[PDB]
Short mmCIF file of C-alpha atoms and ligand atoms in Angstrom, two decimals:
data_model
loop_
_atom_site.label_atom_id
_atom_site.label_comp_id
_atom_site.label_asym_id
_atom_site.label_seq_id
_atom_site.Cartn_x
_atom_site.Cartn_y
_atom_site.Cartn_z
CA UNK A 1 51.69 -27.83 -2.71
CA UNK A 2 52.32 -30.84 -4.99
CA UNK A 3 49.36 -32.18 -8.13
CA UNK A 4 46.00 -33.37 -7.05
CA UNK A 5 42.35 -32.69 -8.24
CA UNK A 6 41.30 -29.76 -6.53
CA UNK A 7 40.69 -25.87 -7.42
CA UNK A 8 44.05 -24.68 -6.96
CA UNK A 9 46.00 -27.90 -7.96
CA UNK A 10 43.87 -29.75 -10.30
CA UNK A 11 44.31 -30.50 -14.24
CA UNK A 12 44.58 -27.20 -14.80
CA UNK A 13 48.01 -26.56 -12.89
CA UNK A 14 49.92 -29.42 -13.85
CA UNK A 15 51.36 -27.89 -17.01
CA UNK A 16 53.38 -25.45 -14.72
CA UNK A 17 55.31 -28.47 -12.73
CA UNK A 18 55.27 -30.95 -16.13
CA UNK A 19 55.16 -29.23 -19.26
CA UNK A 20 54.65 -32.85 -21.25
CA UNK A 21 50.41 -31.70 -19.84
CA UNK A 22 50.67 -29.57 -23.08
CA UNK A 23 52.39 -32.11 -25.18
CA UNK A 24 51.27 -33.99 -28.72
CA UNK A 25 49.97 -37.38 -27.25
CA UNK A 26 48.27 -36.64 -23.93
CA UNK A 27 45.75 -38.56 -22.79
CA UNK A 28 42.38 -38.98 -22.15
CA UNK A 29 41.09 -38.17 -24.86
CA UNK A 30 37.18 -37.98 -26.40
CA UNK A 31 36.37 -40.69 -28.31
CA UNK A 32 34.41 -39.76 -31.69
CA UNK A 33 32.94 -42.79 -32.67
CA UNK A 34 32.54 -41.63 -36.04
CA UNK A 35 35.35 -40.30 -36.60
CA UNK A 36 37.74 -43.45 -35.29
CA UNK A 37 38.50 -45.95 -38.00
CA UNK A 38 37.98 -49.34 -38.11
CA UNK A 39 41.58 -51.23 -38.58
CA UNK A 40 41.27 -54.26 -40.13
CA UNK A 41 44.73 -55.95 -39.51
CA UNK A 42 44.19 -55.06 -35.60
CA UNK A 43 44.09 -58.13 -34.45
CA UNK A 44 42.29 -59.64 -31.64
CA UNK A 45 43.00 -58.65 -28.02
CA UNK A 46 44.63 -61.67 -26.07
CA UNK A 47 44.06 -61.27 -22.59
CA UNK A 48 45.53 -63.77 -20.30
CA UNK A 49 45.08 -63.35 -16.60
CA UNK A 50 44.43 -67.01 -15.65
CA UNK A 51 47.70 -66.90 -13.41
CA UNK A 52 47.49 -63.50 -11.87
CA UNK A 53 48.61 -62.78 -8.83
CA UNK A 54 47.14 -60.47 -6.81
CA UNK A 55 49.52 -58.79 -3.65
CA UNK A 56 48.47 -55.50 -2.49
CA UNK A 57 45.50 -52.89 -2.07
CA UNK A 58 47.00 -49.19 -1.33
CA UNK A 59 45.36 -45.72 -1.43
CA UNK A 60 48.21 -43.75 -2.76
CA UNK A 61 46.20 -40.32 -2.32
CA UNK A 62 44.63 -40.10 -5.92
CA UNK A 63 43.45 -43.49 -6.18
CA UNK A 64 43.27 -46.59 -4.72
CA UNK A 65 45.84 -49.70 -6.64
CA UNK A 66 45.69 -53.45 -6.81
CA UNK A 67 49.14 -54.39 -7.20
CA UNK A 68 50.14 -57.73 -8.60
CA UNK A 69 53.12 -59.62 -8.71
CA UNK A 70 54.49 -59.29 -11.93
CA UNK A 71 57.91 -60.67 -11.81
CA UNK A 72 56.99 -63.15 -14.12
CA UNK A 73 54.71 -63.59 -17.13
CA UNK A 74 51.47 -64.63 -15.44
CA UNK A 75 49.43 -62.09 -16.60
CA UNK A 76 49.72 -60.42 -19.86
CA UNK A 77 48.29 -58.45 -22.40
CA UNK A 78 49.03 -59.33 -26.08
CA UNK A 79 47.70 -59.04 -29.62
CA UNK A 80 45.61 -56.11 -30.48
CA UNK A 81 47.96 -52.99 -31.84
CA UNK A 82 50.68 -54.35 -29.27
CA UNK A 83 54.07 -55.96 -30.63
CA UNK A 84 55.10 -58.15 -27.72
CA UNK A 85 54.27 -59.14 -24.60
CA UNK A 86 53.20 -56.36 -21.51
CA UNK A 87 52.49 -57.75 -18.16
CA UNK A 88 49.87 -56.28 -15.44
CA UNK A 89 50.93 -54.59 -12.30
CA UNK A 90 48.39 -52.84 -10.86
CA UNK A 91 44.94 -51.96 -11.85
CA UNK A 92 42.87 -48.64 -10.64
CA UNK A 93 40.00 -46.84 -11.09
CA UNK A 94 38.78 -42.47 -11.45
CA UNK A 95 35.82 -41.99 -10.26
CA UNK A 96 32.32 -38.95 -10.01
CA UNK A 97 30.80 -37.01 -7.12
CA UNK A 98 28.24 -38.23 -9.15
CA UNK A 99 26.98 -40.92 -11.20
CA UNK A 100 26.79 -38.35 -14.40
CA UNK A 101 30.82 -37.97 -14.61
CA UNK A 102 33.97 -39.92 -13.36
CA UNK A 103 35.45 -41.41 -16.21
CA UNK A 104 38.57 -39.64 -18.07
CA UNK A 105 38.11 -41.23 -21.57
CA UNK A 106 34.53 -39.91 -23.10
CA UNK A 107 32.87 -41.56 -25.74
CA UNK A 108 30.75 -39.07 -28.32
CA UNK A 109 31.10 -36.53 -24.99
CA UNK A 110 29.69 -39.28 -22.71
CA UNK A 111 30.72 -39.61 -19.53
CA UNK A 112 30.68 -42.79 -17.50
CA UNK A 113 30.58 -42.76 -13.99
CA UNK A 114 33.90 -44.38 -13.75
CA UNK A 115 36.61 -45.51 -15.24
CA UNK A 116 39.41 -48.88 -14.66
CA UNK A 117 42.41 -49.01 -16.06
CA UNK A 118 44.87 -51.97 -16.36
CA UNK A 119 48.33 -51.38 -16.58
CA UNK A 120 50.76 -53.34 -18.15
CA UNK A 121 54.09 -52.65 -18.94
CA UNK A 122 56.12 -53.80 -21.76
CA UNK A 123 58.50 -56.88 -21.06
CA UNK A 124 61.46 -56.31 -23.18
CA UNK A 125 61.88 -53.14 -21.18
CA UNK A 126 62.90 -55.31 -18.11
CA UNK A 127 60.60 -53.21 -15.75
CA UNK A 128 57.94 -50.73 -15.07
CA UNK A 129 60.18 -47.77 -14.05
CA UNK A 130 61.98 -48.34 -17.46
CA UNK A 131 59.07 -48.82 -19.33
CA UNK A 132 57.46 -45.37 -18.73
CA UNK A 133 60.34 -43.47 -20.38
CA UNK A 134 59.53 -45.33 -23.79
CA UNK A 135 57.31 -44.71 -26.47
CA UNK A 136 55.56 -48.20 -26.72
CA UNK A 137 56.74 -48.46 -22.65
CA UNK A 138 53.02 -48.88 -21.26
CA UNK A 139 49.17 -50.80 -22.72
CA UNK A 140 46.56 -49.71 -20.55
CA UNK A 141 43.13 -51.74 -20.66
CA UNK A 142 40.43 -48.72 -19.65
CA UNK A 143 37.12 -50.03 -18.95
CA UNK A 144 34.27 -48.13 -18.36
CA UNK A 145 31.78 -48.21 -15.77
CA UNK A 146 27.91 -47.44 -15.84
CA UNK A 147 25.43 -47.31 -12.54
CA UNK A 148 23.20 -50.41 -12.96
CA UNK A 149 23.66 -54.10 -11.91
CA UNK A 150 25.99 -55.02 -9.49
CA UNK A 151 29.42 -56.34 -11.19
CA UNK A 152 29.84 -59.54 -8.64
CA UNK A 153 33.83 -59.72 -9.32
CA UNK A 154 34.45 -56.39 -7.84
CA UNK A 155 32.33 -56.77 -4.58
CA UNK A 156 35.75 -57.76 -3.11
CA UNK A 157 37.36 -54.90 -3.63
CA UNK A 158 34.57 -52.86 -2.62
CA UNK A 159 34.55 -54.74 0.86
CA UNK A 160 38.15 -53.63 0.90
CA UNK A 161 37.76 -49.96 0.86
CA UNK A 162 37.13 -49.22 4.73
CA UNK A 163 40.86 -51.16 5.60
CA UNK A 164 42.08 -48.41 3.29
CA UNK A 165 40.42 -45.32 3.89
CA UNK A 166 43.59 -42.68 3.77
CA UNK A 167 46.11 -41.84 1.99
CA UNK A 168 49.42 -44.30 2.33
CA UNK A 169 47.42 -46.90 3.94
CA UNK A 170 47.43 -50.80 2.22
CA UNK A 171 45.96 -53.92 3.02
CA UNK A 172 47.04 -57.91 1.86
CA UNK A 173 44.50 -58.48 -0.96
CA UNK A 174 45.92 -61.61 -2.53
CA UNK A 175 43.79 -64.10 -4.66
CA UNK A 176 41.91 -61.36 -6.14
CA UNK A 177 40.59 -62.40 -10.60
CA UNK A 178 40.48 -59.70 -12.78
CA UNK A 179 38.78 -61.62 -14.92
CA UNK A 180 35.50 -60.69 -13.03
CA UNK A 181 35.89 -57.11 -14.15
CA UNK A 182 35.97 -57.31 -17.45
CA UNK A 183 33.10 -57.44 -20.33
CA UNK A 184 31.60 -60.12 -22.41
CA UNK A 185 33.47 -58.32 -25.46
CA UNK A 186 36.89 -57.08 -26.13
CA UNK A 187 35.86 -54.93 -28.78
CA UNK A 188 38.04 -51.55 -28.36
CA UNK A 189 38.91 -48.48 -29.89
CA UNK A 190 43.36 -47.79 -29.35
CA UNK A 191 45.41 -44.40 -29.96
CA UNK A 192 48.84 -43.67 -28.50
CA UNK A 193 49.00 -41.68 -25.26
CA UNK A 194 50.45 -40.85 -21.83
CA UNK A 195 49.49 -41.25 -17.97
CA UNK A 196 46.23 -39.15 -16.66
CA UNK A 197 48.21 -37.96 -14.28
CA UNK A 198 51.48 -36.35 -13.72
CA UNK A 199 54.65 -37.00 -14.54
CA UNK A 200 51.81 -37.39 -18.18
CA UNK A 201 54.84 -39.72 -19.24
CA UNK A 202 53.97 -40.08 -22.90
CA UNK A 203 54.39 -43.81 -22.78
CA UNK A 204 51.18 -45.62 -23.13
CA UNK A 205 49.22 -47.55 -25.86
CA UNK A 206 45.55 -46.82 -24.89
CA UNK A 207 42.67 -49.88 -25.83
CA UNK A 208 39.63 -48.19 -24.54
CA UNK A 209 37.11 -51.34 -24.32
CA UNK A 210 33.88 -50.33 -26.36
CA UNK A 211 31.47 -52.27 -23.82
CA UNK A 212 31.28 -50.94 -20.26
CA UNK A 213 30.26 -53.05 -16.81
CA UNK A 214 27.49 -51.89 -14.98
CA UNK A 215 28.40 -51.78 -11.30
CA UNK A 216 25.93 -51.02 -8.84
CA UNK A 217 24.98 -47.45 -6.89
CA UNK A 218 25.92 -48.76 -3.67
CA UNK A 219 29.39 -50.21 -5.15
CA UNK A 220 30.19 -46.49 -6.43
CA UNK A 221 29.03 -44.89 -3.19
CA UNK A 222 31.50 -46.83 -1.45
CA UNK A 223 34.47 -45.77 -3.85
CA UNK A 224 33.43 -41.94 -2.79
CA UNK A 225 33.94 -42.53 1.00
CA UNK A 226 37.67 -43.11 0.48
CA UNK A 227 40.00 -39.70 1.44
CA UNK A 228 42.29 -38.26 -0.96
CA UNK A 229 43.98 -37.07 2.99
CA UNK A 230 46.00 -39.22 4.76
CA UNK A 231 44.83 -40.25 8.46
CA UNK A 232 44.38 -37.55 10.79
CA UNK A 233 44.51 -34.65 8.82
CA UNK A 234 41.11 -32.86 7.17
CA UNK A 235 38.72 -35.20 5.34
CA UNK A 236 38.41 -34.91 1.68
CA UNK A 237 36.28 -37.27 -0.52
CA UNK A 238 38.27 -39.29 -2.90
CA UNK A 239 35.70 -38.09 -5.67
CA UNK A 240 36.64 -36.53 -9.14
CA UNK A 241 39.82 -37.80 -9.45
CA UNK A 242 39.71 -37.50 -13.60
CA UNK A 243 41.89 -35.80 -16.16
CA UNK A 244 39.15 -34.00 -18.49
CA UNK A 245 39.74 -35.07 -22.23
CA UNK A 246 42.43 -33.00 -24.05
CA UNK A 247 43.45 -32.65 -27.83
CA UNK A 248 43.83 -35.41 -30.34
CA UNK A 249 46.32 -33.44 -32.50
CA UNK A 250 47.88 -35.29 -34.72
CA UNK A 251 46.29 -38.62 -33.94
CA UNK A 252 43.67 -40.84 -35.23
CA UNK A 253 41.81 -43.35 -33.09
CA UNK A 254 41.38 -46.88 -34.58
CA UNK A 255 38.70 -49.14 -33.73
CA UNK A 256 38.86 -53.24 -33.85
CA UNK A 257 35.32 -53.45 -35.08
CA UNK A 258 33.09 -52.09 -37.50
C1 VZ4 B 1 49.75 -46.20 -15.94
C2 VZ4 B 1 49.52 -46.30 -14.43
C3 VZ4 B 1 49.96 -45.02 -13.78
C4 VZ4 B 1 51.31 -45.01 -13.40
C5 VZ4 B 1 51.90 -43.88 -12.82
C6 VZ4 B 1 51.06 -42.78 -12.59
C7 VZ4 B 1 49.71 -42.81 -12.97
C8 VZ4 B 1 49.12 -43.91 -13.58
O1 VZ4 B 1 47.75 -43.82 -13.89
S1 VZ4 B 1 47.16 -43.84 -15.27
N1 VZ4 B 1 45.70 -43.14 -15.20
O2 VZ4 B 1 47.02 -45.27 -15.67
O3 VZ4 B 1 48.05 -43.10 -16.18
C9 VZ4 B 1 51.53 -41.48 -11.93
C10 VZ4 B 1 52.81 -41.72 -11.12
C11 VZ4 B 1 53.85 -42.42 -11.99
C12 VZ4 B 1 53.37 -43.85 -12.37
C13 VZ4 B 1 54.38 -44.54 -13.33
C14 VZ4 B 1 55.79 -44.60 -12.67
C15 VZ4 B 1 56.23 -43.19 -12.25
C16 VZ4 B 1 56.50 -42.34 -13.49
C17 VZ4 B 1 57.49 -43.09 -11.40
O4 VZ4 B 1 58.49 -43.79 -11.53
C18 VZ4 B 1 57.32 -41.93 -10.41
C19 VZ4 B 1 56.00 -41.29 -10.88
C20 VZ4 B 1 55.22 -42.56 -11.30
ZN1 ZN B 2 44.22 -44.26 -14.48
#
């Protein structure tokens, strides 16, 4: 009986098996637009994924991951609230039944239809599995999505989806850009906070891009035919895998723009 998204072991539950659910900097969180400050002194985001290296697509049971190889500095985040370098290695999405809910972050209550988040972990940590049990261990990139035009860069990993179906199945998905999933601006609100899901290792530097990408309806349908259950057991749609937002506390949300 282990963490997932459902009625008896959904968001709700987690606190019981990791207690950190309840703690001072969980994430998501709502975003209050008029509330968050603008920061001047944040400086610009510096995205650089011109070298990354895409490996890997797996369905891991509560989403589905594009891993990259990240054993050197070929794609990293920089600049923003970060000190240092943090380097991608893997990028996911959460996801609605329907197109009215699906993302974890809100904005003003809003709810996108999905959500991506970039991970990147912090380099003078040595590695990811060291990184999470730091402070400043993790920068996540979230991105949301909106039902509209298709986003062309992420038609490939919709095409994907069928080779991965169940959960612990992967596929080869090398020469995949990230670049085609991202917005024409880097504009972004950032607050300190954990993983959405357990261990809800408080760990991460959130920057919550203020523009979303419009992907298409058919490109979210096809997220909701994965299975959160692996092959041959009962089907369960791979929809509503979100964390609902949870308390700010004691933190204030800063915004790179006025
Ligand atoms: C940040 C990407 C991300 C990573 C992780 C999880 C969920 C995530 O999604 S999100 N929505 O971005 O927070 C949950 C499992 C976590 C893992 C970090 C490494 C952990 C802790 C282990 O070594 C064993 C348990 C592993
Ligand atoms: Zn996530």
């Amino acid at each position: 009986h282990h963490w997932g998204y459902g009625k008896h072991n959904g968001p709700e539950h987690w606190h019981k098996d990791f207690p950190i659910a309840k703690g001072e900097r969980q994430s998501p969180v709502d975003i209050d637009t008029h509330t968050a400050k603008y920061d001047p002194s944040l400086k610009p985001l510096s995205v650089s994924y011109d070298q990354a290296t895409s490996l890997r697509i797996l369905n891991n049971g509560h989403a589905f991951n594009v891993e990259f190889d990240d054993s050197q500095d070929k794609a990293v985040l920089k600049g923003g609230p970060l000190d240092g370098t943090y380097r991608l290695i893997q990028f996911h999405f959460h996801w609605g039944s329907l197109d009215g809910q699906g993302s974890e972050h809100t904005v003003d209550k809003k709810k996108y239809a999905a959500e991506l988040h970039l991970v990147h972990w912090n380099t003078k940590y040595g590695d990811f599995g060291k990184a999470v049990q730091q402070p400043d261990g993790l920068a996540v990139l979230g991105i949301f999505l909106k039902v509209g035009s298709a986003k062309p860069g992420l038609q490939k990993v919709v095409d994907v989806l069928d080779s991965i179906k169940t959960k612990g199945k992967s596929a080869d998905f090398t020469n995949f850009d990230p670049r085609g999933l991202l917005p024409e601006s880097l504009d972004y609100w950032t607050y300190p906070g954990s993983l959405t899901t357990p261990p809800l290792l408080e760990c991460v530097t959130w920057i919550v891009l203020k523009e979303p990408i419009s992907v298409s309806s058919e490109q979210v349908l096809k997220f909701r035919k994965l299975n959160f259950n692996g092959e041959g057991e009962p089907e369960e749609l791979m929809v509503d895998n979100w964390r609902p937002a949870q308390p700010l506390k004691n933190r204030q949300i800063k915004a790179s723009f006025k």
